[PDB]
Scaffold this active site. Sequence first.
Site, PDB file in Angstrom:
ATOM      1  CG  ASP A  44      33.806 -44.164   8.277  1.00  0.00           C
ATOM      2  OD1 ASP A  44      33.868 -42.994   9.089  1.00  0.00           O
ATOM      3  OD2 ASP A  44      34.087 -44.300   7.039  1.00  0.00           O
ATOM      4  CE1 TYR A  49      31.968 -43.953   1.392  1.00  0.00           C
ATOM      5  CE2 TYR A  49      31.980 -45.079   3.887  1.00  0.00           C
ATOM      6  CZ  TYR A  49      32.634 -44.141   2.773  1.00  0.00           C
ATOM      7  OH  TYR A  49      33.565 -43.372   3.315  1.00  0.00           O
ATOM      8  CE  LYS A  78      33.178 -40.966   6.373  1.00  0.00           C
ATOM      9  NZ  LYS A  78      32.613 -42.305   5.835  1.00  0.00           N
ATOM     10  CG  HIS A 111      31.551 -38.011   2.648  1.00  0.00           C
ATOM     11  ND1 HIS A 111      30.671 -39.190   2.332  1.00  0.00           N
ATOM     12  CD2 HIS A 111      32.840 -38.653   2.412  1.00  0.00           C
ATOM     13  CE1 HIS A 111      31.602 -40.228   2.044  1.00  0.00           C
ATOM     14  NE2 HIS A 111      32.700 -39.975   2.093  1.00  0.00           N
TER      15      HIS A 111
END
Length: 316
Positions: A44, A49, A78, A111
């Site tokens: 994931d 990130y 996402k 997201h």
Amino acid sequence: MASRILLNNGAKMPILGLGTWKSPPGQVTEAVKVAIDVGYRHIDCAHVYQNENEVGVAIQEKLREQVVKREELFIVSKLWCTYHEKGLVKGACQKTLSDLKLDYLDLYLIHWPVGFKPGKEFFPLDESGNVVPSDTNILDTWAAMEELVDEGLVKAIGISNFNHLQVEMILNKPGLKYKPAVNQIECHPYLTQEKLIQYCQSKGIVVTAYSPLGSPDRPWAKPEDPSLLEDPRIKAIAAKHNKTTAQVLIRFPMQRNLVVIPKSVTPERIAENFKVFDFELSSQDMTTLLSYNRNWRVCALLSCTSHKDYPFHEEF
Ligand SMILES: NC(=O)c1ccc[n+]([C@@H]2O[C@H](COP(=O)([O-])OP(=O)(O)OC[C@H]3O[C@@H](n4cnc5c(N)ncnc54)[C@H](OP(=O)(O)O)[C@@H]3O)[C@@H](O)[C@H]2O)c1
Ligand SMILES: O=C(O)Cc1nn(Cc2nc3cc(C(F)(F)F)ccc3s2)c(=O)c2ccccc12
């Protein structure tokens, strides 16, 4: 316990994946390498990130080493909030693909249901700390997501942090091309999500549980906050099975027919967290864990609560 769940596009999604939020680039490459070695096939990811390049390095190396084939991996990313405009979606997806060194994603999610002002900052704030929205809407963003499937960039599309009315908005779209395959939501014993899970599963949408360990590394944690991994009641259930509390917390959503994505960068824990296919929680265990619900959410930024599409004012 079957290890994969069938999605609406005919693909099978591993029910256990590796989370990567807060995995620093200086460590995440090793984490993903170890995860693949011990059996993880689902990763994931997200542009926000700030580590997709380093995830990509690890995947590429393991493909090259002949450890796994691409078709055996299930890679999720996402679309960040600053890219909800129809004209920005493809480029955001392609940046993720480039960073991950992939030619398709298995699953691409919206997201969050909110659009933020486009620009370099992930969290554009005004001078008083409010997030600056964009004028985008869920249905137009979904239409742009559908194009990614049509162009072969992604095999499936879904959503994350959508409430049931927001999910319904997409389902009821006239001329809908693809139904969301997945809704990825926070879910753990303190936020059990019974109504949203029932809704999604009744509509043929697979639910992925994020923060299953309660995200103890979340940056806004306060010492007074509840701690799942330290909850002595959950420790006692773990002890009865000769498992760790984390292993119990991972097995719990699996037995609710959810996908679960615990995060670690610690090699011992990555391996520990995968060793959840060799025991079962009892009916009483499951009942007891569900009983711990407090409707306590660890992911919900104060600065976003006045966005028109903020998801968490609704009951579910
Ligand atoms: N869609 C969204 O909006 C959204 C939001 C939040 C999360 N997510 C996804 O869900 C993933 C999981 O959620 P999360 O990262 O919030 O938190 P989490 O998986 O609930 O907890 C991760 C924390 O637990 C620690 N940990 C992991 N295994 C452990 C074990 N066996 N024993 C003790 N501690 C352990 C990790 O430490 P170390 O890493 O230092 O080992 C880290 O501090 C994310 O990484 C992300 O991929 C998605
Ligand atoms: O996003 C992640 O995966 C993890 C995540 N969560 N949060 C809390 C959030 N709460 C939100 C609430 C909305 C809202 F839709 F509610 F407006 C929109 C966007 C957010 S980010 C963060 O602040 C964050 C910062 C950097 C990287 C990842 C994250």
